[PDB]
């Protein structure tokens, strides 16, 4: 009780929301380009109309002026300009586990409106119940992550999660679903929306319309003698420079087109370990000081501590880590 509540205090304040997901088979995010129209773009103005979207870190921004032989494949690989480039580091076939310290994935029983007393009580009570040792029972997870999943600990990831927790989605999503208003996708063109979209057959200005239109080939045209400052012509245009068209289409403000295609990324059940539960159990055998020291170094497996990262972004890949760690 005295040493149990002391171990709980230390284990909770440090590792309450820290978990280790093991992929059945190491499977990285399969594409270099991400189509996520549900997220608003940064916009041309100095001050954006939307608060910073973490996904903007991966934005393949179109610049109107580029050197004579500039192509998008130099910085953004196969990604479409105007959408997102997923860097090498977030699609590493060597990563076998996903370490994260975050409370953004809890289901409805956890929320800020509740006092910290209620949240802490309910989380430790669910962690005890939903674990065999330090391993979470399948019922704690979403069904998509593991068969028999009932969201008793973690909620399902949603369409907007990638806008604010991009690494969580790239690393944990079992399926990639596009959200697209790009002309050509799902065979929807500016000419056939009156046939592909049932709710349309001709109100909000954005009704029955695509966002980005198919222009043609990507090219750099040098009109003047300056060969370091030529006219860039992208494959697609944003004709009215709209930055939240897709976000408003998602938030169901009006009728019109939407293209949602799925790509299976990870197959087979995840294994999830609770680092608070591991802390609580290993401290009875090795002592709180060595368990706290060891689990802290485990959170620094990459050189940057995961518990010191912002909650929305504290999702990192590890290569064949030894868990539980060696306790001195
Ligand atoms: C990371 O992981 C996250 C977790 O998995 C993931 O989140 C999930 O994201 C997906 C993708 O956005 C979400 O699913 C979609 O939900 C759409 C909305 O559904 C509601 O509205 C519909 C419209 O009225 C209802 O039908 C629908 O009811 C159904 O679902 C209920 C549960 O939600 C269920 O209880 C009901 O019984 C019922 O079955 C619900 O109320 C939905 O519209 C969408 O469906 C399309 O896309 C699917 C995937 O490709 C297709 O399988 C499906 O058939 C639909 O495709 C059609 O429509 C598209 C346009 O919307 C077209 O592009 C397609 O080509 C296709 O169109 C053809 O067929 C039409 C008729 O079927 C026809 O009219 C057309 O002409 C054409 O022939 C899909 O289910 C999911 O809900 C999210 N999960 C959670 C928990 O939030 C996240 O996205 C991932 N992130 C990243 C970055 O990858
Ligand atoms: C999280 O995602 C899972 C899917 O992976 C959701 O579970 C599924 O939810 C649907 C809609 O409620 C269930 O469909 C219903 O099934 C009953 C019969 O079981 C049927 O009578 C209804 O007509 C309807 O089709 C589906 O059973 C269920 N699937 C599984 C495997 O559980 C879940 O609801 C999402 N969680 C939350 C909290 O949003
Ligand atoms: C651009 O490409 C052409 C064709 O390969 C080449 O001849 C030319 O020197 C390049 N321009 C510059 C400014 O390097
Ligand atoms: C994966 O590990 C192997 C062996 O150490 C290495 O050759 C390869 O470059 C690594 N891949 C990435 C994407 O770092
Ligand atoms: C977990 O909680 C449920 C709900 O009270 C209960 O039925 C179940 O027996 C509990 N499991 C354990 C390990 O006590
Ligand atoms: C788009 O058209 C091609 C045939 O030209 C077809 O194979 C493909 O499945 C269509 N896609 C959709 C989503 O309708
Ligand atoms: C994480 O490890 C690196 C060595 O790779 C070290 O420089 C850094 O101080 C460690 N962080 C902590 C909190 O000890």
Numbering used by the authors: 218 to 419, 427 to 552
Provide passages from the article that reported this PDB entry.
The FV envelope (Env) glycoprotein belongs to a class I fusogens, which are synthesized as single-chain precursors that fold into trimers, and whose protomers are subsequently cleaved in the Golgi compartment during transport to the cell surface. FV Env is cleaved at two sites by cellular furin during maturation, giving rise to 3 fragments: the leader peptide (LP), the surface (SU) subunit, which includes the receptor-binding domain (RBD), and the transmembrane subunit (TM), which harbors the fusion machinery. In this manuscript we present the X-ray structure of the RBD from a zoonotic gorilla FV at 2.57 Å resolution, which reveals a novel fold. We identified, within the RBD, two subdomains in terms of their structure, conservation, and function: the upper subdomain, which encompasses most of the genotype-specific region, and a more conserved, lower subdomain, important for binding to the attachment factor HS.
Recombinant RBDs from several simian FV (SFV) strains were tested for production in Drosophila S2 insect cells, and only the RBD from gorilla SFV (strain SFVggo_huBAK7422, genotype II; abbreviated as ‘GII’ herein) was expressed in high enough yields and formed crystals. To increase the chances of generating well-diffracting crystals, a fraction of the purified protein was enzymatically deglycosylated (RBDD) with endoglycosidases H and D, as described in the Methods section. Crystals were obtained for the RBDD, as well as for the untreated protein (RBDG). The RBDD diffracted better (2.57 Å) than RBDG (2.80 Å) and the structural analyses presented below were carried out using the RBDD structure, unless otherwise noted. The upper subdomain forms a wider (~45 Å diameter) and the N- and C-termini a narrow lobe (~20 Å diameter), which is also termed lower subdomain. The lower subdomain is comprised of a three-helix bundle (α1, α7, α8) that packs against an antiparallel, twisted four-stranded β-sheet (β14-β1-β5-β15) and against helix α2 (residues 333-346) that lays perpendicularly on the side of the bundle. The upper subdomain is formed by two long excursions out of the lower subdomain: ~70 residues connecting strands β1 and β5, and ~130 residues connecting η4 and β14. The N390 side chain and the first two attached NAG residues are buried in the RBD, rendering the EndoH/D cleavage site inaccessible, which allowed building 10 sugar residues in RBDG and 8 in the deglycosylated protein crystals. The N8 glycan emerges from a cavity that has N390 at its base and extends upwards, remaining in contact with the protein and preserving the same conformation in both crystal forms. The 7 N-linked glycans that we could resolve in the RBDD structure are all fully solvent-exposed, and additional density was observed in the PFV EM map for the sugars attached to N5, N6, N7, N8, N9 and N11, validating the RBD placements (the N7’ site is absent from PFV Env, and no extra density was observed at this site).
